[PDB]
């Protein structure tokens, strides 16, 4: 039936750009170099994906294998899953461990012993565990050509990135080490590549206001440029052995209210286009690793109530999810190129059951399986054949108006076979047809 | 003169059919490691010989089956370098090989059998290899010269093979190949071109195992797949006149469920003057759990005797087993790289037959440190582990002879690799991991004992997974960076540290105290990391070497007359700066970089003496400690492709350079440690203990 | 996006009152204009001109200040001496309430009208309540005070030494521009309401005297002309350089003299000395160049601080101008039973286009682009044949005419407000009659050379109605509908009746049998033949004898007009910033607009 989600985690390193300025980024705790020995950057150590890392002693097999087998004994003995690859830069480490790791966790899936990551995924194609899909981290100055590659080489679909803010003061106070610029450059590189991009942004940083927030957020969503396809709230915490917690013992920083953060959360969980997706609303950290913040970790409820009380429903597609329903398409500017967003809609309850993203090649695209004159469909999903409905219209959408020869969608391993029915061939990692 | 080796360590790769154990009287063990094939005779307990002619990783081994009973001593070996290798022994030594050629992909599973086809004389072998192309090619021997017979591109895409074996039905090869859904292929050659036969097709899942049998006139096929069910074709047929397979399914069982590695029936063995060939089939699963399956129990249950294994310890089972010359031991090969063995000593139900399996690293071997006065060893690997043999004096109550060597602990299963170590004491020593901190671990009280017990039973291998850590007692903060060498002085009073670094404030050298454990000094003249750096034998000075292509004599008061030296260079070597050695009267140091220029200097000015050349760059220098009257050095340098060249000294050609093994080492050589005879290490499993006599 | 345009436009010539005009106001609910001038003079002369002329209390020259009160009944009034004078029109009385010996350079007040603050000519800024008395004062000082974690020659050769000030729609901040000696540059700060900094401006490299603050709170404009371009940059609320946008003019050649925003913070107005006032928007973070206005010397400009979209200029030669505005979309519908749609976009020098019948496009993207060299006014399609649009260009009154490739047409060799379109070749280009304010219909028909006709008609019109098929001209009043106007013959104004509001929106539609009007009013009243059928409408659109609506409460309704009749699932709900654009009648294709810039489409 569904579809379970499996979580691994990386060994312990140091973030890239502490060579040039000589510290990590303020709000940061953990790592190499924290009270909290043996845990990789980004985490304390006390959470379940954590400890399961933490007791692997970090080997993609066994903690895979531990998920997997816990997973099956609890009932459900799913048929797909979607790995989740978490905590610090994962390609600011030598080539070679990157090429271990990732090989080793296709070869966890049906039990090859492959040498190298082309048989590896060459193989995991034809298993029986049908992996859908798997996502990476990665900060802006370690997106660009070559790391992009590298991405789609492992099959990866989907890719998140923290920017956390749209001011420059705040990357040159809190110590990024990278220009505003480098997102714009790492959004489009990204968007017009294939990925679907997840981004990262953190309520109530050091010296921001709280309507500063609100004016950032509008600008966040309004701004053509600094549009996402999936939204990473994480409110700011302070916690002990970073410069965050120096600057709230001297009594120079603080932190809002209980009732201004739910009133924050409702205004910008309100604001929210209905093609965007909140992923994480809080943070995953425990009760008493944090000093100060929100202490109770059910602030969707609060945030719902909130809304409720106020006046305004939400359309984000978290809750807007499972008489006839009807197809409705919707276009924006984002990035520098054109979109299209369908779905089939039931308007008189407001939900969804189908829905499909398409974007055309802007300009210069360097991934040469585009080579220009294309268009890719970013994401596909199906709710529960409503599905070949969809890729008829996006079919018809790309040979009408864009006006283009070629199409390629992005698809996972395990499901390179079902765009076979159709009569797609495969370039590189993609999906391919001609018009 | 002679250079023999007396002892090796190592241990089998992780692919599934890694090792193979002969049939019949006498028989023998031959698995793999980095890039050779190791023998290994489980009447005794010592390697013979290695099979060092790959260039890649070994993954398939089988023995050439002779039919009449008897040792056959001829085998097969697929690499990962694309290649399929055939090779003939006949004795411990011979070393012969064919060197096939390319395959295009990496084999994972081979097979071969006789051709039994007397009529043409002394009949010959043939080999059917699949790869990663998703290939199935058959190789044959007639002689001296190789017999390419026919290629058949099994598919066009990805649909691969699972496994493979050959037998003869009754007059003509036959091959059962697999393909990954359901499917077994099987089939047959006209001429020489083989042609389909047919294609079974009963599993729900992936298929693993496939092996033949034979009882009376009718062959068996078992099988094993990942769907919770064993499978079992008896089969009774005549070979195609152009006629074809008469197949016959069977009951099945309920073993283990989960997946099933690898299966075997029972081979046929000479007793009593005749043959006999059981009905047996054992497998190999993935919970931890063996099941001896019994024939029908005269009803047609099938149902076991005894299911060894307990659940408890390791979830990721076996990859393989096999049996030893009859049903009498039993032995398997764990998921992590260790091995199994069981015997039943004329009792129905089995036990443990521990003290005879070979264990070793299965991740590179980093550097190693010889004994105070030579009672055991220590090495560190790339495997998070750190692992102790010493020497086993209580052989047999009758056979006091013929000391061998085995492994005796594992002090600590770490979080990281371990790049550096040096021994502080008799029962204590220092490494230093990839962490930025050093670490120091003693000896308990609860291994002297057994230590006495057996070094004046071998522990087994829950053993040394479960019940053999040594407590950890200090921690060494100080350093910024990666560990990348460690020193020890001469009297146990100094240590001195050197940190992975880049820059001019990180490539300062640190000390130690050995008693207070606090930082009494740091140096700081070297551009970049320091990659060695050794003490004198006496007091009066401290070489060091680093990447920056030069040395440096530079040590200072330790402050705990002048009590030491300094002196530099400005460049004399072109490439990165690999070794250091002293005299034993202290009156030269040699230094050897990776430029294959190995340099004395003399004992203000320090020139030179006379420069050498090698074959292959240098990694590692040492010198006997043992001084000759004529006035003369002995080096034993060790380089990067695994070899060992020994070199005499001579005050001012006079060099001897004749002094070297064959089949010494598969990968490069970290470090060579006299003995005060001495070791050599790899960075392919392989640790090794040398002897020199002259 | 939309497209503004012109709307009733006023006129009026009082009489040369004593020498020149310096600064005027706006009375709002007795709705006349005040002007001051030199020789104390205070002259309400525009409308009835209740005017009551006083002797201001020879002095200095210039007069700074004039403010209504609209509640204490009385105007205030301020001079370059410095002399803060109650006074009050229907009385004719006098009282000096402040005075500094110092003298003053600007008055602001609250947009409450609370309380106020005045610059001393002495370098000082000082604060009073509703009664005239100083309750604090400061200077232009350095130390900023440390807000936040944050603690050569290179002035303009034209830059004028007079600080500007002001305030922010919700009044809690406002912003002060000076200028520092000892570096000679130009400086910005805010301060709040209780009168205590709150931030600084960081280090600019060449900035302005202009000043201008965004009501919705959001955003100030500057100047900061760049070595190499020119450009107006933004300032957030804690100062600091925030994005910019470039003017397209030319290095050296011109000058920034003024800033200003509308009633509803939508509208930018900027003045531009060599002469130009030139009115922009925002779509997506793309700064639309709507309209352009040259003129020769302006006194003042002043936004209407009650109603939208109205603006009062005050010229040098005794000339008042009073301009009005509409904000609807240019679009190309109803123009055959053909499957035909496309909308088109003023924006700078060039327009854009959007097919929405073979294409959907958002707002900042376009297909068939056209370029134009001078700025364009206006843009209309055709009644019945074809879709080429004819496009006015507010420089040269030059008109182009684009085949629907785009074969172009155009004469080889204010005014012209509503140029109407007639499928052959016909402009019906209305105006306006001088000091008289008349309504004026012109009859203008194209080395073929533009040649008008003039004919004249009572009343003011408002909005003239669209040639459907087969069909002559239709204008608005300030009451009712007149003028069938028979397109080749002058005719009569009889009815076809009698609006209750001038419907801001309006159409004629052939309901059934019979020719029925239908409009909409900012009150969002839906009105059909003179009645109210409901209250709640936001936009609307007729086709094929169906009406489309907005129920501006959550819900889109569609209505049959097969019936001819209608009074107060089928229904679809609908977010909350929806606005109707074109619709494709067989294929029911509703595209729906929302606030953010993104498009949806309804079937
Ligand atoms: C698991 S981290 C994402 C991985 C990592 N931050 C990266 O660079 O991609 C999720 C978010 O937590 C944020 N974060 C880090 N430290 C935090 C803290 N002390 N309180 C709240 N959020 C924090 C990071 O900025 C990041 O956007
Ligand atoms: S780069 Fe990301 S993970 Fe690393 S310290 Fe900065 S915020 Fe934390």
Redesign the interface.
């Known amino acids: 039936s569904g579809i379970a989600v499996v979580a691994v985690m990386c060994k312990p390193h140091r973030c890239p750009h502490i060579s040039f300025t000589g510290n990590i980024c303020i709000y940061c705790p953990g790592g190499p170099d924290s009270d909290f020995e043996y845990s990789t950057q980004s985490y304390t150590g006390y959470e379940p994906t954590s400890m399961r890392a933490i007791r692997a002693r970090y080997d993609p097999f066994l903690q895979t294998r531990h998920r997997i087998e816990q997973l099956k004994q609890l009932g459900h003995s799913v048929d797909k899953v979607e790995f989740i690859v978490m905590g610090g830069t994962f390609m600011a480490l030598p080539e070679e461990y990157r090429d271990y790791f990732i090989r080793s966790l296709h070869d966890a899936l049906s039990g090859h012993t492959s040498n190298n990551i082309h048989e590896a995924i060459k193989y995991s194609e034809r298993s029986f565990t049908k992996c859908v899909g798997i996502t990476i981290e990665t900060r802006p100055d370690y997106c660009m050509k070559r790391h992009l590659s590298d991405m789609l080489t492992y099959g990866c679909t989907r890719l998140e990135i923290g920017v956390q803010s749209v001011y420059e003061d705040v990357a040159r106070d809190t110590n990024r080490g990278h220009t505003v610029k480098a997102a714009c450059e790492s959004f489009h590189l990204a968007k017009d590549s294939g990925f679907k991009v997840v981004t990262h942004m953190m309520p109530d940083l050091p010296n921001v206001g709280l309507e500063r927030d609100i004016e950032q957020f509008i600008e966040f969503f309004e701004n053509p440029a600094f549009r996402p396809d999936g939204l990473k709230l994480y409110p700011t915490l302070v916690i002990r052995g970073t410069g965050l917690y120096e600057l709230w013992k001297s009594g120079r920083y603080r932190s809002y209210s209980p009732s201004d953060l739910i009133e924050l959360v409702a205004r910008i969980l309100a604001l929210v286009p209905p093609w965007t997706r909140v992923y994480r609303v809080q943070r995953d950290i425990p009760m008493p690793l944090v000093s100060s913040g929100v202490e109770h970790g059910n602030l969707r409820e609060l945030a719902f109530a909130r809304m409720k009380d106020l006046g305004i429903q939400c359309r984000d597609v978290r809750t807007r999810e499972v008489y006839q329903v009807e197809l409705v398409r919707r276009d924006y500017v984002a990035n520098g190129g054109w979109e299209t967003f369908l779905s089939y809609e039931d308007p008189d309850q407001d939900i969804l059951i189908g829905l499909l993203r398409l974007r055309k090649c802007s300009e210069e695209t360097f991934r040469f399986e585009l080579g220009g004159g294309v268009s890719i469909v970013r994401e596909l999903h199906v709710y529960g054949g409503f599905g070949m409905l969809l890729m008829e219209e996006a079919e018809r959408i790309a040979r009408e108006e864009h006006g283009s020869g070629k199409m390629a969608v992005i698809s996972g391993v395990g499901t390179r076979n079902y765009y076979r029915k159709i009569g797609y061939r495969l370039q590189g990692p993609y999906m391919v047809k001609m018009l | 003169s002679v250079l023999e080796v007396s002892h090796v360590f190592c241990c089998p790769n992780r692919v599934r059919g890694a090792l193979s154990w002969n049939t019949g009287p006498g028989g023998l063990l031959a698995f793999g490691t980095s890039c050779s094939v190791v023998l290994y005779d489980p009447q005794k307990k010592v390697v013979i010989t290695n099979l060092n002619g790959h260039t890649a990783r070994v993954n398939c081994l089988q023995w050439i089956r002779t039919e009449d009973g008897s040792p056959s001593n001829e085998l097969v070996s697929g690499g990962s370098d694309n290649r399929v290798i055939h090779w003939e022994l006949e004795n411990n030594q011979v070393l012969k090989s064919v060197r096939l050629q390319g395959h295009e992909g990496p084999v994972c599973a081979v097979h071969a059998i006789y051709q039994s086809g007397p009529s043409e004389g002394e009949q010959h072998a043939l080999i059917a290899s699949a790869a990663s192309d998703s290939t199935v090619r058959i190789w044959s021997k007639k002689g001296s010269e190789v017999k390419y017979l026919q290629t058949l591109s099994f598919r066009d895409g990805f649909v691969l093979s699972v496994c493979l074996a050959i037998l003869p039905g009754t007059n003509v090869p036959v091959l059962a190949c697999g393909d990954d859904d359901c499917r077994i292929h099987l089939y047959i050659q006209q001429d020489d071109q083989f042609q389909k036969a047919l294609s079974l097709c009963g599993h729900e899942d992936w298929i693993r195992g496939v092996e033949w049998a034979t009882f009376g006139r009718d062959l068996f096929l078992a099988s094993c797949s990942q769907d919770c069910l064993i499978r079992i074709w008896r089969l009774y047929m005549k070979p195609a006149s152009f006629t074809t397979v008469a197949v016959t399914l069977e009951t099945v069982l309920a073993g283990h469920e989960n997946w099933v590695n690898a299966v075997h029936w029972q081979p046929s063995f000479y007793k009593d003057g005749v043959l006999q060939q059981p009905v047996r089939l054992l497998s190999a699963s993935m919970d931890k759990t063996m099941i001896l399956w019994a024939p029908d129990e005269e009803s047609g249950v099938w149902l076991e005797q005894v299911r060894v294994g307990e659940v408890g310890g390791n979830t990721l089972g076996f990859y393989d087993c096999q049996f030893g010359e009859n049903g009498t031991m039993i032995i398997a090969h764990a998921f992590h790289g260790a091995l199994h063995l069981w015997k039943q000593s004329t009792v129905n139900p089995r036990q443990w037959a521990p003290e005879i399996v070979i264990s070793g690293h299965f991740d590179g071997v980093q550097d190693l440190m010889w004994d105070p006065e030579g009672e055991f060893i220590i090495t560190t690997s790339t495997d998070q582990t750190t692992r102790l043999f010493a020497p086993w004096k209580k052989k047999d109550q009758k056979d006091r002879s013929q000391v061998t060597w085995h492994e005796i602990a594992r002090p600590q299963i770490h979080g990281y690799n371990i790049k550096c170590l040096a021994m502080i004491d008799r029962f204590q020593f220092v490494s230093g991991a990839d962490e930025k901190v050093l670490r120091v671990f003693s000896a308990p009280r609860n291994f002297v004992e057994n230590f006495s017990v057996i070094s004046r039973e071998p522990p087994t291998e829950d053993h040394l997974l479960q019940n053999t850590l040594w407590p950890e007692i200090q921690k060494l903060y100080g350093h910024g960076y990666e560990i990348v060498c460690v020193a020890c002085n001469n009297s146990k009073t100094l240590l001195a540290s050197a940190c992975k670094a880049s820059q001019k404030e990180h490539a300062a050298i640190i000390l130690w105290s050995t008693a207070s454990w606090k930082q009494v000094q740091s140096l700081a003249f070297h551009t970049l990391t320091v990659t060695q750096m050794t003490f004198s034998p006496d007091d009066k000075f401290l070489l060091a070497v680093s990447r920056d292509r030069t040395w440096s004599l530079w040590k200072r008061q330790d402050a705990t007359s002048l009590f030491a030296f300094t002196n530099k260079i400005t460049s004399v070597h072109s490439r990165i700066i690999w070794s250091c050695d002293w005299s034993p009267d202290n009156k030269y140091f040699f230094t050897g970089s990776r430029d294959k220029k190995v340099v004395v200097w003399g004992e203000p000015i320090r020139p030179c003496s006379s420069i050498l050349d090698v074959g292959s760059s240098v990694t590692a220098v040492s010198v006997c400690p043992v001084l000759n009257p004529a006035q003369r050095y002995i080096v034993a340098i060790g380089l990067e492709s695994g070899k060992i060249c020994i070199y005499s000294w001579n005050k001012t050609w006079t060099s001897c350079v004749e002094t070297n093994p064959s089949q010494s080492h598969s990968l490069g050589i970290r470090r060579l440690c006299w003995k005060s005879h001495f070791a050599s290490c790899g960075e392919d499993h392989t640790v090794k203990i040398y002897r020199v006599n002259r | 996006m939309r497209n503004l345009k012109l709307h009733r436009t006023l006129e009026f010539r009082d009489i040369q009152a004593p020498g020149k005009p310096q600064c005027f106001c706006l009375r709002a609910e007795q709705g006349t204009v005040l002007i001051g001038s030199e020789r104390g003079l205070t002259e309400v002369d525009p409308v009835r001109r209740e005017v009551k002329t006083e002797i201001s209390l020879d002095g200095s020259g210039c007069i700074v200040g004039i403010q209504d009160l609209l509640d204490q009944e009385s105007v205030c009034v301020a001079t370059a001496s410095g002399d803060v004078i109650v006074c009050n029109l229907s009385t004719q009385q006098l009282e000096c309430v402040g005075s500094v010996a110092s003298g003053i350079s600007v008055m602001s007040w609250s947009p409450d009208q609370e309380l106020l603050l005045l610059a001393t000519a002495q370098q000082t800024l000082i604060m009073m309540t509703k009664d005239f008395e100083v309750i604090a004062e400061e200077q232009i000082h350095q130390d900023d005070f440390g807000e936040?974690?944050?603690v050569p020659e290179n002035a303009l050769p034209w830059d004028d030494r007079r600080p500007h000030i002001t305030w922010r729609g919700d009044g809690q901040y406002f912003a002060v521009s000076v200028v520092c000696r000892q570096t000679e540059a130009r400086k910005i700060r805010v301060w709040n309401r209780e009168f205590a900094l709150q931030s600084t401006s960081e280090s600019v490299p060449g900035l302005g005297p202009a000043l201008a603050w965004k009501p919705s709170g959001?955003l100030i404009a500057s100047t900061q002309d760049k070595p190499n371009q020119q450009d107006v940059v933004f300032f957030?609320?804690?100062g600091?350089l925030?994005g910019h946008f470039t003017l397209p003019f030319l290095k050296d050649e011109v000058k920034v003299n003024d800033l200003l925003w509308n009633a509803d913070s939508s509208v930018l107005a900027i003045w531009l000395e060599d002469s130009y006032v030139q009115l922009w928007t925002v779509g997506?973070?793309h700064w639309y160049l709507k309209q352009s206005l040259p003129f020769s010397q302006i006194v003042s400009l002043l936004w209407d601080p009650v109603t939208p979209c109205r603006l009062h200029v005050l010229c040098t030669g005794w000339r008042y101008l009073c301009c009005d505005w509409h904000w609807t979309t240019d679009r190309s519908s109803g123009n055959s039973a053909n499957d035909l749609a496309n909308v088109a976009v003023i924006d700078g020098n060039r327009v854009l286009v959007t097919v929405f019948r073979?294409?959907?496009?958002?707002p900042?993207?376009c297909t068939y682009r056209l370029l134009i060299p001078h700025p364009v006014n206006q843009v209309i399609f055709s009644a019945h044949l074809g879709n080429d649009l004819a496009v006015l260009d507010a420089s040269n009154q030059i008109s182009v005419y684009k085949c629907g490739h785009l074969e172009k047409r155009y004469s080889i060799q204010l005014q012209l407000s509503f140029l109407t379109w007639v499928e052959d070749d016909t402009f019906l280009a209305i105006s306006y009659s001088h000091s008289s304010s008349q309504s004026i219909i012109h009859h203008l028909t194209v080395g073929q050379l533009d040649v008008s006709s003039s004919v004249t008609v009572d009343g003011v019109v408002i909005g003239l109605c669209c040639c459907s098929k087969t069909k002559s001209l239709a204008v608005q009043l300030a009451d009712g509908q007149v003028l069938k106007y028979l397109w080749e013959s002058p005719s009569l104004a009889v009815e076809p009746v009698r609006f209750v509001h001038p419907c801001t929106q309006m159409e004629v539609a052939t309901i059934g049998g019979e020719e029925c009007v239908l409009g909409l009013t900012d009150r969002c009243r839906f009105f059909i033949n003179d009645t109210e059928v409901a209250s709640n409408i936001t936009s609307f659109a007729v086709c094929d004898d169906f009406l489309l609506v907005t129920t501006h409460s959550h819900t889109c309704q569609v209505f049959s007009l097969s019936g001819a009749s209608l009074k107060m699932?089928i229904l679809?709900?609908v977010?909350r910033g929806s606005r109707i654009v074109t619709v494709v009648p067989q294929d029911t294709k509703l595209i729906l607009q929302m606030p953010?810039?993104?498009?949806?489409?309804?079937?």
């Open positions: 936040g974690k944050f959001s957030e609320k804690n600091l925030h997506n973070y073979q294409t959907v496009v958002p900042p993207m699932e679809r709900k977010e953010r810039g993104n498009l949806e489409v309804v079937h």
